[PDB]
From a paper:
The human heterodimeric amino acid transporter 4F2hc-LAT2 is a membrane protein complex that mediates transport of certain amino acids and derivatives thereof across the plasma membrane. While CATs are N-glycosylated, LATs are not but they associate with type-II membrane N-glycoproteins from the SLC3 family, i.e., either with 4F2hc (SLC3A2; CD98hc) or with rBAT (SLC3A1), to form heterodimeric amino acid transporters (HATs). Light chains are polytopic membrane proteins with both termini located on the cytoplasmic side, which function as the substrate transporters. Anticalins are composed of a central eight-stranded antiparallel β-barrel backed by an extended strand and an α-helical segment.
We overexpressed the human HAT 4F2hc-LAT2 in the yeast Pichia pastoris, purified the protein in the presence of detergent and solved its structure by cryo-EM at 3.2 Å resolution after complex formation with the anticalin D11vs produced in E. coli. The structure of 4F2hc-LAT2 with the bound anticalin D11vs was captured in the inward-open conformation as evidenced by the large cavity (red asterisk) facing the cytoplasm. The 4F2hc-ED sits on top of LAT2 and forms a complex with D11vs. Local resolution analysis of the map indicated that the highest resolution features (2.8–3.0 Å) were located in the substrate binding region of LAT2 (S) and in the interface region between 4F2hc-ED and D11vs (I) (labels S and I in Fig. 2d). Interestingly, three defined densities were found in the substrate binding pocket, which we attributed to water molecules: H2O-1, H2O-2 and H2O-3. In our structure, H2O-1 is 3.9 Å apart from the amide nitrogen atom of G57 and could thus correspond to the location of one oxygen atom of the carboxyl group in an amino acid substrate.
Author numbering:
A (entry chain C): 8 to 180
B (entry chain B): 41 to 492
C (entry chain A): 177 to 630
Write the structure that this text describes.
């Protein structure tokens, strides 16, 4: 199960960073990470992208922990392509796992599909995510996501749709 | 004797140390692989040192190997220190170590899980030592007679270890021999501990510094002696490595470090009839080792007295029995005084350090004799790489031993420095000490005449 | 007297030598003989590692039994003496007719893969424990539709897999099993009858001691894992009471010191108590059972979108490539393997000590009184190295205040003892301390070592 060629994954043309900012939900996850269709998908979490004056994104993962609403913050620096990104806080140490975030296709209104890669010294991993503005997207987008994931070689079982919980990702609790 | 030479060399080198050393090396090696590497390196360095000593013997043919060489070389105060340290340190401590080994092997079956009482160990060691010194004093006939049965017991123990090791490597899966869990197992290697590992491994190789010249009788010693030295020591090293792998196959390395008698536990794990074979055979081996050490120490006392450094009180053979009773009594007293250490392996370090401290000195003397006073007829010559590499290793050993365990080694150095002044008193007296010393000596001689 | 003195001294020397021999024999007979070692079954040594969901444990790995052999090197690094593979047998949710306990699920692998895995584990000295819970994909582990058929198929599967070579089994969620103790006794005695080195673990969610004791009444040689210590309590006195109550009610029989059934420590415990509870579980008298990921303190709520029941094992920062930067370096196996002070390193050290020390393996356990908030006890064998563990479950720095005279004099407390390791930094290992005035930091655990008195 090798990493796909970067050329094969599409890119979003005329990528407008201003529109992409906001709170995306995760409505599908494809990748050889350990999750399978048969088992528990998990609890849906949200990713908040805030655009900065230097065009770098501030990314906040919010999810529901044991009892605390849990948050985590990172920063994406724009890559070579307008729609590509890389994890910020780069250091010369080879131990760091370079990241190759890449937006595959989005209408900026209700859905998006993005591709992540985590090339590492001893490992090369990738994943695809179906971001959505609402808790649940229409079935057609899920079918398109499954087709695109299968294009990269991921079996059907590797694709997972987290349960749309109504606490922390949306509201308080 | 083209072939018997290898036999005599192997018999002199191979002893009971293999029954006590293996816990010492591994305990400091930290892994089975490092243990076997230490054994191999010690074997090679012993080959080098024996070769240098053979060269020195051919260049300086004189009785008292390792003493005459250090006497004719370095002038005075060097050979006297060799004799002083050999009498005070090396022989009493070798006898004490072998006696403690006998006691540990005798008592291991009775207390397999927990330390036996220290008083029991010391009493059994003293019992063995006193019986052996008595049999040596009474007559040399019995001393040479019992050596056959003791050597037979030692050979039986070694042969059974080797056989039960080769059987188990086929079916025992050799879990620890393979690199799986065979390196960096107990602790990360430390050079300070590796020096102590080499000191304890060298204890297995003994009786080559002085027994490779005093005993050689070859048809063409110049032609054959280098061959014998090069072909007898390596097979001894192979035997030691085979014994170590047999131990590690029979028992886990952790189980080997908490035994105090490696062969007893080996026989327990493998031999169904264990107690009837291993402890008794090793006890015979230790008896033979102590008896041989006693005979050799008395022989050394003979030359020590003849050279005039020692008083005539010693090295006096009894008339009815042709035995050096006064020489044996002093070694017995010194060994009994050494038997209050309570540590089987501390003594090993304490002796090995001194052994190396003088082996290196002798090799340095060889180098000096090469550089200064050359052109001497040397029937067999050695490439100057071997002595210098030996010296390099010797320096490492000493430095790191002092870095790691500066107490036992320090005490040995202090003993040597305490022996240094006596030589001046012997050589030059600013004022003759006729008030006490002479009278004391006379009284001692009189008493020796009266009771012995 | 000139010649008479010679013979007199010679015979006096022989008399003294014989007196020394008699004294040696007397001392040997007076010495205390070593106590026999117990029947140390393979699971009495070291911990057990419950792998649960293999697909989650391997993460980016293959996800099948054939791919599980890659991790056996890591598990050997942990020095766990056993594995509890999740239920691999083929199962249709809530269908007793369509579930078979003798067929491996196609997704998990094939029979040949399982045989190769068992061979490799045996080569590495790891022993597999196949858990045979009939309905592991359903809401209730034991089908409600039928009872007798489920037990019959479990017995048949136990026979078949014992023939295959598994070194034991495990049965979970027994609270839902009807007529549990009888079936447990039957399965346990059949498994022991096949061979002595074969354990049957039992899992319950009950936290009441009386229910556990009733379950153990029929068979006293059954390893039971239950949520008994799961209640955090947050008081050392409470945990001390739980441990002593259980040990003295069960009769000091061998027990499994697992914090739960098929759950991680991080579900019950907060982040700051993981090291303390690891020390306690590794030093208490029994066989600690750890769910996978407990060595790195894996928490299902630490990362977004991670299943609560079966969190994905974090082997490196690329374990989740969908959330860049969320998986910090120091919450992974690779990150914590390079840190001398980390939960994984502490787990490795404690497992090593548990596996090799003859006082922790099989040794008497005696807890004694400390100022309230402290759980302090001693593990000691016969004239062997003794260990003393002092745990500060409170959140306020407390003077240890050890005062233990009720303990046997054979395990008397010396004035000083080494410091084998501390859960928190700030102390020098190997330095003897003053037990009379030993200070303890909040949420700190000290493992001290002292030798046999003589
Ligand atoms: C185990 O005990 C049960 C009790 O119901 C019995 O039926 C079965 O034969 C026993 N099996 C043994 C002792 O192997
Ligand atoms: C534990 O098992 C009992 C028995 O079926 C059940 O009633 C209960 O809901 C379970 N959960 C807890 C937390 O006790
Ligand atoms: C166990 O300990 C408790 C502590 O309260 C005590 O009441 C009980 O009698 C003890 N039982 C046994 C058998 O030791
Ligand atoms: C190390 O792990 C702890 C978890 O106890 C976490 O709080 C801390 O942030 C981690 N280190 C860094 C640099 O984030």
């Amino acid at each position: 199960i090798p990493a796909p060629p970067l050329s094969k994954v599409p890119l979003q043309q005329n990528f407008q960073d201003n529109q992409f900012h906001g709170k995306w939900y995760v409505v599908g996850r494809a990748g050889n990470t350990g999750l399978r269709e048969d088992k528990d998908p998990g609890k849906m979490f949200a990713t908040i992208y805030e655009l900065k004056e230097d065009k770098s994104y501030n990314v906040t993962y919010v999810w529901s922990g044991q009892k605390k609403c849990m948050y985590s913050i990172v920063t994406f620096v724009p890559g070579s392509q307008p729609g590509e990104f890389t994890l910020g806080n780069i250091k010369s140490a080879p131990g760091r796992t370079s990241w190759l975030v890449r937006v595959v296709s989005t209408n900026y209104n209700q859905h998006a599909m993005v591709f992540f890669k985590s090339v590492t010294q001893n490992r090369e991993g990738f994943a695809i995510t179906l971001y959505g503005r609402t808790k649940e997207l229409t079935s057609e987008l899920k079918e398109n996501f499954i087709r695109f994931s299968k294009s990269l070689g991921l079996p059907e079982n590797h694709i997972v749709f987290p349960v749309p919980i109504d606490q922390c990702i949306d509201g308080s609790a | 004797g083209l072939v018997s030479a290898c036999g005599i060399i192997v018999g002199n080198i191979i002893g009971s140390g293999i029954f006590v050393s293996p816990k010492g090396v591994l305990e400091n090696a930290g892994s089975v692989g490092l243990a076997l590497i230490v054994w191999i390196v010690t074997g090679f360095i012993t080959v080098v040192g024996a070769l240098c000593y053979a060269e020195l013997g051919v260049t300086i043919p004189k009785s008292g190997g390792d003493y005459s060489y250090v006497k004719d070389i370095f002038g005075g105060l060097a050979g006297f220190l060799r004799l002083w340290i050999a009498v005070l340190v090396i022989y009493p401590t070798n006898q004490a170590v072998i006696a403690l080994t006998f006691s540990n092997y005798v008592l291991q079956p009775l207390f397999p899980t927990c330390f036996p009482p220290e008083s029991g160990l010391r009493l059994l060691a003293a019992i063995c030592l006193l019986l052996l010194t008595w049999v040596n004093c009474s007559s040399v006939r019995w001393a040479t007679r019992v050596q056959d049965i003791f050597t037979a017991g030692k050979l039986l123990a070694l042969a059974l270890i080797i056989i039960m090791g080769i059987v188990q490597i086929c079916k025992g899966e050799y879990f620890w021999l393979e690199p799986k869990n065979a390196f960096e197992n107990f602790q990360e290697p430390d050079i300070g501990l590796v020096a102590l590992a080499f000191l304890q491994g060298s204890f297995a190789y003994g009786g080559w510094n002085f027994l490779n010249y005093v005993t050689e009788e070859l048809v063409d010693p110049y032609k054959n002696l280098p061959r014998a030295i090069f072909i007898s020591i390596p097979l001894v090293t192979f035997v030691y490595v085979f014994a170590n792998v047999a131990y590690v196959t029979a028992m886990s390395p952790q189980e080997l470090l908490a035994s105090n008698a490696v062969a007893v536990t080996f026989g327990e794990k493998l031999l169904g009839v264990m107690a009837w074979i291993m402890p008794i055979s090793v006890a015979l081996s230790t008896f033979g080792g102590v008896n041989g050490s006693l005979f050799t120490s008395s022989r050394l006392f003979f030359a020590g007295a003849r050279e005039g450094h020692l008083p005539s009180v010693l090295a006096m053979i009894h008339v009815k029995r042709c035995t050096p009773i006064p020489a044996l009594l002093f070694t017995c007293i010194s060994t009994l005084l050494m038997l209050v250490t309570s540590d089987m392996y501390t003594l090993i370090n304490y002796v090995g350090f001194i052994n190396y401290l003088f082996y290196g000195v002798t090799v340095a003397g060889q180098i000096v004799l090469r550089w200064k006073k050359p052109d001497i007829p040397r029937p067999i010559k050695i490439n100057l790489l071997f002595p210098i590499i030996y010296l390099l290793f010797w320096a490492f050993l000493l430095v790191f031993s002092l870095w790691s365990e500066p107490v036992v080694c320090g005490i040995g150095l202090a003993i040597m420095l305490t022996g240094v002044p006596v030589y001046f008193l012997g050589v030059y007296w600013q004022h003759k000490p006729k008030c006490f010393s002479d009278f004391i000596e006379l009284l001692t001689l009189v008493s020796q005449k009266m009771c012995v | 007297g000139w010649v008479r003195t010679r013979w007199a001294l010679l015979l006096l020397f022989w008399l003294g030598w014989l007196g020394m021999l008699a004294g040696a024999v007397v001392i040997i007979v007076r010495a205390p003989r070593c106590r026999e070692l117990p029947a140390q079954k393979w699971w009495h040594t070291g911990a057990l590692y419950r792998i649960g969901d293999l697909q989650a444990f391997q993460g980016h790995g293959a996800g099948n039994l054939a791919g599980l052999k890659g991790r056996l090197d890591y598990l050997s690094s942990l020095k766990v003496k056993g594995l509890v593979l999740g239920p691999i047998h083929k199962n249709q949710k809530d269908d007793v007719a369509q579930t078979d306990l003798l067929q491996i699920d196609p997704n998990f692998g094939s029979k040949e893969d399982f045989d190769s895995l068992l061979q490799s584990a045996k080569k590495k000295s790891i022993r597999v424990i196949l858990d045979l819970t009939p309905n592991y994909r359903g809401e209730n582990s034991w089908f409600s539709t039928q009872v007798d058929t489920v037990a019959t198929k479990v017995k048949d599967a136990l026979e078949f897999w014992l023939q295959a070579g598994v070194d034991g089994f495990q049965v979970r969620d027994i609270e839902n099993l009807k007529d549990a103790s009888s079936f447990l006794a039957e399965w346990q005695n059949i498994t022991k009858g096949f061979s002595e080195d074969r354990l049957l673990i039992a899992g319950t969610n009950s936290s009441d001691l009386q229910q556990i004791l009733s379950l153990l009444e029929s068979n006293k040689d059954l390893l039971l894992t239950s949520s008994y210590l799961s209640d955090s309590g947050s008081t050392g006195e409470h945990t001390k009471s739980l441990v002593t109550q259980y040990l003295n009610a069960t009769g000091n029989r061998w027990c499994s010191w697992s914090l739960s059934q098929a759950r991680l420590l991080t579900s019950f415990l907060p982040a700051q108590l993981l090291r303390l509870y690891q020390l306690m579980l590794f030093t208490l008298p029994g066989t600690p059972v750890f769910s996978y990921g407990d060595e790195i303190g894996l928490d299902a709520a630490a990362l977004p979108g991670q299943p609560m029941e079966a969190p994905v094992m974090l082997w490196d920062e690329s374990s989740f490539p969908d959330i860049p930067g969320a998986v910090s370096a120091n919450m992974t196996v690779k990150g914590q393997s390079e840190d001398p002070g980390s939960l994984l390193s502490l787990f490795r050290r404690l497992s090593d000590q548990r596996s090799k020390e003859r006082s922790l393996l099989h040794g008497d356990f005696h807890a004694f009184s400390a100022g309230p908030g402290l759980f302090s006890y001693i593990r000691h064998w016969d004239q062997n190295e003794r260990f003393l563990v002092v745990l500060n479950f409170g959140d306020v720095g407390l003077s240890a205040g050890l005062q233990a005279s009720d303990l046997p004099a054979s395990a008397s407390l010396p004035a000083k003892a080494d410091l084998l390791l501390s859960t928190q930094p700030g102390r020098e290992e190997g330095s003897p301390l003053e037990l009379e005035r030993l200070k303890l930091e909040p949420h700190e655990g000290l493992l001290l070592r002292f030798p046999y008195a003589a």
